[PDB]
Amino acid sequence: PLTRPYLGFRVAVGRDSSGCTTLSIQEVTQTYTGSNGGADLMGPAFAAGLRVGDQLVRFAGYTVTELAAFNTVVARHVRPSASIPVVFSRDGVVMSATIVVGELE
């Protein structure tokens, strides 16, 4: 596929109760897409549990580069139901969650 939208969320770099350098999203970007679907109507947001104040690293160890990396990984996969392993944290908490991004209508 060929997807690569623009960043419409917020990214804040800091430290959690554990301390593993992880960024958290204070917005909702999982509500739009393009190419091989371009559904855009809220899907991978609630389905994956991704909400404001959630830590999205998508990389083992609880850490991520920037929004560009998250946008590339999320864009790279535009399947009607692709299951990609993503690591999430809740203020130092360690938990695993699977994001199901379903494009198309």
UniProtKB/TrEMBL annotation:
Subcellular location per the Swiss-Prot or TrEMBL entry: Nucleus, Nucleolus
Annotated protein name in UniProt: Uncharacterized protein
Included stretch of the parent chain: 1528 to 1630 of 1634
